[PDB]
Copies of this chain bind each other. A is one copy, B any other.
Amino acid sequence: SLFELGKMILQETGKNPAKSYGAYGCNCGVLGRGQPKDATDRCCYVHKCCYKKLTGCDPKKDRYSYSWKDKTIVCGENNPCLKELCECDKAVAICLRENLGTYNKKYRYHLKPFCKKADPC
């Protein structure tokens, strides 16, 4: 759920997750996808494409178990949908962290209605 996703983001990046990523660019946080603005935004595009397969569960609301072990996100076993979900969230948290060096605060609260349409996943 958003709770685990947020915690992962914090653990990896060290940043307040909703502040930095709850509304970033055309793809991070709320709403759907859009033409990406930059690498941070692309992480979120990938993230939301990863979610598409998860028709058996709810990426926003469904809780799942993971642990932080040796500064690594380790998804707990669960049902396949929640496990895959956890792995989508792990991957975006790592990607956002990896791309902190080009994070641009001008995109932090991007006006998403004006984004151009995303390519299909």
Contacts and interface: CB of A to CB of B under 8 A. Distances in A.
Contacts of A18: 23, 108-109, 111
Interface string A19-47: 10011000000110000000000000000
A26 to B, nearest CB: 13
Nearest to A19: B109
Report how many copies the assembly holds. Answer: 2
Looking at chain A's contact residues, is the secondary structure mostly helix, strand, loop, or mixed? Answer: loop
A31 to B, nearest CB: 6
A16 B22 CA distance: 16
Contact of A61 (B3, B16, B114): B114
A19 B23 CA distance: 10
Nearest to A110: B18
19 contacts: A2-B111, A2-B113, A3-B111, A16-B109, A18-B23, A18-B108, A18-B109, A18-B111, A19-B109, A22-B23, A22-B109, A23-B23, A23-B30, A30-B30, A30-B31, A30-B112, A60-B113, A61-B113, A61-B114
Interface of A: 2-3, 16, 18-19, 22-23, 30-31, 60-61, 108-109, 111-114
